[PDB]
Amino acid sequence: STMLVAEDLSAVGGISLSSALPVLTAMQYDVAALPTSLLSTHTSGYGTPAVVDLSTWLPQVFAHWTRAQLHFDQALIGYVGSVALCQQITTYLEQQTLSLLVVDPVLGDLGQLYQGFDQDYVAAMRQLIQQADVILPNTTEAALLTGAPYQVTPDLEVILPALQAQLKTGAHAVITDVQRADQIGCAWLDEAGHVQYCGARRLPGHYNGTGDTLAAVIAGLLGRGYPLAPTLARANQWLNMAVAETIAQNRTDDRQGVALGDLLQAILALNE
Ligand SMILES: Nc1ncnc2c1ncn2[C@@H]1O[C@H](COP(=O)(O)OP(=O)(O)OP(=O)(O)O)[C@@H](O)[C@H]1O
Numbered sequence: 450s451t452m453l454v455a456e457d458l459s460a461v462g463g464i465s466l467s468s469a470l471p472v473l474t475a476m477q478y479d480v481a482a483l484p485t486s487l488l489s490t491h492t493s494g495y496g497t498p499a500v501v502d503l504s505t506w507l508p509q510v511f512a513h514w515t516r517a518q519l520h521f522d523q524a525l526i527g528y529v530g531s532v533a534l535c536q537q538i539t540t541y542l543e544q545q546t547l548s549l550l551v552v553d554p555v556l557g558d559l560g561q562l563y564q565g566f567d568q569d570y571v572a573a574m575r576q577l578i579q580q581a582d583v584i585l586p587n588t589t590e591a592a593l594l595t596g597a598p599y600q601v602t603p604d605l606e607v608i609l610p611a612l613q614a615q616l617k618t619g620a621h622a623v624i625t626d627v628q629r630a631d632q633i634g635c636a637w638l639d640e641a642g643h644v645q646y647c648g649a650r651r652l653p654g655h656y657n658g659t660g661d662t663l664a665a666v667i668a669g670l671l672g673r674g675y676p677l678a679p680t681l682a683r684a685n686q687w688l689n690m691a692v693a694e695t696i697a698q699n700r701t702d703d704r705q706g707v708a709l710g711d712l713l714q715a716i717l718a719l720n721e
Pocket residue numbers: 558587625626633634635649650651652653654655656657658659660661663684685688689692
């Protein structure tokens with residue numbers, strides 16, 4: 450099958466689209482790799498990157514694909530970056546008949562919207578997520594989506610249903626960076642409306658591209674028919690492993706995204 454992946458491409462950095470590609474390809478997908486933005490390097494640690502504004506390009510891309518009669522099976526949407534691009538993506542996706550749409554609602558972290566994002570971006574995001582089968586906000590994002598003031602540990606019994614209220618029936622809101630004791634992981638509502646959690650032991654440090662890889666792995670697994678719970682279980686273990694690998698490399702450069710070798714190996718093994 451074919452998966453559309455629409456997110457930022459940084460030439461240097463090993464995150465987002467650059468990490469999605471190997472991952473998804475190895476997971477047996479033909480990837481339609483669509484940059485929403487093109488950068489010299491990611492935005493953390495290399496100084497101001499050189500960036501291409503793709504706002505006038507994506508409409509052309511979509512128009513083209515349309516006339517060419519291309520149809521996508523699955524879609525993963527990551528970092529978009531502008532109100533207009535979200536709008537464009539939203540309508541394009543509406544035209545497709547997707548069996549799977551996963552949207553990582555990139556908006557912020559540590560209680561605040563990322564620089565450049567305002568409440569207009571937030572509203573644009575709320576529109577984009579309306580058809581999503583799964584959304585993967587972090588704790589800050591969840592709050593922003595619902596309009597609840599940020600809480601470091603929000604009440605999952607409250608925020609989860611609130612989020613679900615914005616999604617279609619049967620879709621799922623999964624909060625991704627939930628910390629419980631020495632664990633870090635994902636929380637969501639099961640079919641009976643009960644809060645579930647699946648985590649792995651938190652490792653020291655902070656890494657780039659973790660969210661990106663998590664999203665790719667989740668899309669990929671779901672795309673292949675794995676129920677949500679087992680998907681989340683595996684994704685978390687896989688990320689844990691990737692971060693472990695990363696530490697193991699004893700890197701001198703803390704900017705490069707999470708290592709993928711072990712992850713690719715795991716994917717190949719699952720494949721048989
Ligand atoms: N230090 C860590 N140790 C273990 N696992 C981690 C760690 N950091 C992240 N993870 C894993 O990766 C997932 C990604 O969560 P995270 O909160 O980092 O995504 P994110 O908000 O996009 O972060 P990033 O900002 O780097 O994308 C977590 O669910 C967990 O599975």
